[PDB]
Amino acid sequence: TLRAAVFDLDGVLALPAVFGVLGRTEEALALPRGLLNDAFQKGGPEGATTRLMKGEITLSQWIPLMEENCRKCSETAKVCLPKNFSIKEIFDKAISARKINRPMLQAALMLRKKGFTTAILTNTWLDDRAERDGLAQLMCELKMHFDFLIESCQVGMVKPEPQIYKFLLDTLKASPSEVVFLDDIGANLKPARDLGMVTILVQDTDTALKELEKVTGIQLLNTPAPLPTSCNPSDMSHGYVTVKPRVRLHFVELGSGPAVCLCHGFPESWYSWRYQIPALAQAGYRVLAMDMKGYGESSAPPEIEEYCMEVLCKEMVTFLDKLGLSQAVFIGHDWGGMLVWYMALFYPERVRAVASLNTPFIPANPNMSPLESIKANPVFDYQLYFQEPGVAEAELEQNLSRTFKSLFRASDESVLSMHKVCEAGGLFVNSPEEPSLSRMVTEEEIQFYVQQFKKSGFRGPLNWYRNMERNWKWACKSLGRKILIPALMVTAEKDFVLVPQMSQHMEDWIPHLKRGHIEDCGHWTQMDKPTEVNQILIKWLDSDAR
Amino acid sequence: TLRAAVFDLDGVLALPAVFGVLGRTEEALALPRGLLNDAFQKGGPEGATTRLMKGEITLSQWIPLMEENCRKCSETAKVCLPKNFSIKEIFDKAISARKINRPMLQAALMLRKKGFTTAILTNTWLDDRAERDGLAQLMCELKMHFDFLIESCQVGMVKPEPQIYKFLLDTLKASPSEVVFLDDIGANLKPARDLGMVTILVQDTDTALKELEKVTGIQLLNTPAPLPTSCNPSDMSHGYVTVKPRVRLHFVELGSGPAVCLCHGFPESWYSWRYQIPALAQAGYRVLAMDMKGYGESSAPPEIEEYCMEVLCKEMVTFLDKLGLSQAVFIGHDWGGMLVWYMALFYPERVRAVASLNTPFIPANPNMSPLESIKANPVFDYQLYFQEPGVAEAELEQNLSRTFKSLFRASDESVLSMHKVCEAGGLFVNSPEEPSLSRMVTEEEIQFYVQQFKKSGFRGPLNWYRNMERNWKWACKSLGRKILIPALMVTAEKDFVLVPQMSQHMEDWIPHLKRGHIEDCGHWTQMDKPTEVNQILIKWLDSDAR
Ligand SMILES: FC(F)(F)c1cccnc1N1CCNCC1
Ligand SMILES: FC(F)(F)c1cccnc1N1CCNCC1
Ligand SMILES: [Mg+2]
Ligand SMILES: [Mg+2]
């Protein structure tokens, strides 16, 4: 029956409410009880406040009117306002104090996820104060989570006027009885109730959610911790930079603030960062999530040498040049992890800070050929398998859904070991035709990857693995250096290829290296433990790159 | 004969030179003459400094070695270094003191423009200091101007070793006698001279340029003031945001820092900002130069209402939402100018600051229909001509080269008046078949526009002019407001359609409005007077939006 949920901003999706600062200020300042609320409402339907809420005037135009109102209210109450009494001040403070009420947001999210149409309906103002960015940020963070945002000052109507609920219903394409509406002000609920909408009077959040659970029949309270916000590909800004004649790089871009360049591993995608992209932007960074050369909408030239580290690095520098970026923070995973360590060693002036997930920094051994190093470690056997052009291409391209469904697995689910892969004749020889879906990924998400790999296949990706010697020679040039810019190594307990212990000597080359560590996390770090990844990167960004 | 020019960084393209701080510091501190230069060079070919310049070690690794060297040099000179003597300190200060030597850069630019191949060849270091961004910025600003940048620390070779000049010559694809090489250090010139390259020993800039003028036979000194840097379209980052199902917006993006959204007029392009894009990025802003709806690589739906101001504005807000931008500075010209005034009035929380070139802010007249307002002013007659769908489309699309060559004219060149256009039967009825090229535009540049307008033609563009009534109704809602966020109006003396005097009452609606004014500037502001435009916007950005 119920198909839509409507939430207010003040006192429902964001707390403390601002009218609340009228009551608090009166008490803090020992003013006549209600004096500030009287001034806020002076003239009712035709007073300053309603003109504000309808968008006839801006907030700065309103401030002196409210000032006058307070003056007149105190005259009639025969008291004096304190020296320093400032409506600008009170309102600035209250508006910066108000924060998203997280459980109410998660309830909206949940309802939207079971197919509800959701909306914010709010009496609000055109905000032109010097400090407006504060509110602009809040609304941005909230609105993306809802089907509609209806603002009194944009539609020229205010609760409790009945025409706004008609506008609401019309925007929802729903009949009143299909709608639950939550508000902290009872007068604002009445016209919803008159139309036969279910209403909830929000005093404390938890009780309001209990009512909402009862009435929708969906669990909202005591729900497990949800995943971080993901990205929908067709809502992203897609960027394209040509770095040389046959090579154009694609990236997704979100946020403002210091530039943070995300470099995915093999065989992956910008989309592998779908959980960090919104969290890092929300945390105050400008996120550039690449398709690395060889993948997705980036070019994929066929030649092996096009993917040695030196070429790849110089290309990443050109990409900053063309974007007019003097530096970026570089964060890599797996192959992208190796690449950012090289950016740090060969282009520190362009790297604000460097972090790697899973991929440790290991200096080249100038006395031992890389192939020999590789044959020492049974778990790198899969790398020998990747050497002969065509062999791994044919197995990986044969059935893309099956490829990513076999690769993208949480630590308790594997179908493929990286163990004696050559001898077996390949990666999937002992895995099923139709693997079960990992808990880390939906069917939709697998199909995104499938579709990306239909453009270029696995030649480009596999080429990253085919410059052992050439990378070894270039890396040898860096053996006298150390990495002395800010650096974070994040180890994954259950990555059985890039094991935590392989990172154990890193402090010799990076004396001030910082660390994080994630337990019960396999190789696909960002999607396996997206909450822990976000929290470790934001903490390290805030303290080391900001 | 001469076909290439090679410049050093320190003491040639950037001044003061850093070895210069060794001499200065000695003098400032009353140290034994040359003590610091001795320490800088200790061990020569195998000393710390050469390993630095070859990229064996980073700058921070070098700092303690140079410290030791100074200690040993003073021991042997039997003096003591002052308390507080800090190589880190001296080097930080010197490296931030060094700035582009503008006349040397303009000489390189000029030579490149007459077809020289140009290069920077420099002995330099991998810079990993906390303050490295300073140098990263310099190199970025310089390198874009040259065909090659060759850095000792990247190629593992240093001047004066002969192998670097061979590497140089090989990079240039030129024989030694086709090359002029400038350096401030004579020892570094010798191996160039040995190979038969022309050399210039740069002491003072002007004399070095006199020598360079003599030897290339091209005027470099006392040249008129050059245009600002322009953009090459295929070197830009191209961004694409879908703002609703049939509407995707394209923009070009350059720089980091506060977001600055550039909105072009009718019938124009992101490319109309080609002169401001690099200058604003260089000045510390993140430039987003739009193709506005209807143009270039943005979508161009056919329906008239798709281009009323309300839809256009809401779309620009969505574009910030999807980019994760809580605000941007909005700078408009002509129609984009009108649009940003509306952004200011209807979305001040999203507008950090607003500026318009040519387009004044005039409040709707609630008592007079817009059509009547329009018929009052003979100079708006061209707008009546634009109303009937198809008519102006057919004339404007008939011959694109002729269209833009007729439209884009400096104030002393016009072929078309905006005068009794309806009566005449159109815009070009009294203009030539093949107009002469304006001084403001090359043939290449016209052809860029031609090619952009081949995608969608003039229906979308013309539609901007076809919502007089609808814009009038929406604007009426804003008649109680004022614009109280930072605002700049730039008038153009010789725009005979958007005349300076039409902006004369603006302080009534925008009390703290700031102004600039450009003389002898026609309607095509950005390309007519690009130097004056850049200087007025950067000054206003720095003081009001930063
Ligand atoms: F097959 C596979 F993709 F290689 C792979 C499969 C499973 C686990 N880890 C893998 N690797 C990713 C590439 N770098 C080394 C680790
Ligand atoms: F033809 C033309 F494009 F309209 C035009 C031609 C010449 C000068 N100014 C023009 N206008 C540009 C559009 N807005 C009004 C001014
Ligand atoms: Mg409320
Ligand atoms: Mg020099």
Curated annotation (Swiss-Prot), chains A, B:
Belongs to the AB hydrolase superfamily. Epoxide hydrolase family. Residues 258-530 form the AB hydrolase-1 domain. Homodimer. Changing K54R: Decreased phosphatase activity; no effect on epoxyde hydrolase activity. One of its GO terms (molecular function) is lysophosphatidic acid phosphatase activity. The active site is at D334 (nucleophile), Y465 (proton donor), H523 (proton acceptor). Its EC number is 3.3.2.10, 3.1.3.76. GO terms for cellular component: cytosol; extracellular exosome; peroxisomal matrix; peroxisome. The N-terminal domain has phosphatase activity. The C-terminal domain has epoxide hydrolase activity. This is Bifunctional epoxide hydrolase 2. The gene is EPHX2. The modification Phosphoserine is found at S369. The modification N6-acetyllysine is found at K42, K190, K214. It catalyses: an epoxide + H2O = an ethanediol; (9S,10S)-10-hydroxy-9-(phosphooxy)octadecanoate + H2O = (9S,10S)-9,10-dihydroxyoctadecanoate + phosphate; 12-phosphooxy-(9Z)-octadecenoate + H2O = 12-hydroxy-(9Z)-octadecenoate + phosphate; 12-phosphooxy-(9E)-octadecenoate + H2O = 12-hydroxy-(9E)-octadecenoate + phosphate. GO terms for biological process: cholesterol homeostasis; dephosphorylation; epoxide metabolic process; phospholipid dephosphorylation; positive regulation of gene expression; regulation of cell growth; regulation of cholesterol metabolic process; response to toxic substance. Pfam families: Abhydrolase_1, Hydrolase. Mg(2+) binds at D8, D10, D184. Residues 234-546 are annotated as: Epoxide hydrolase. Keywords: Acetylation, Aromatic hydrocarbons catabolism, Cytoplasm, Detoxification, Hydrolase, Lipid metabolism, Lipoprotein, Magnesium, Metal-binding, Multifunctional enzyme, Peroxisome, Phosphoprotein. CDD domains: HAD_sEH-N_like. NCBIfam families: HAD-1A3-hyp, HAD-SF-IA-v3.
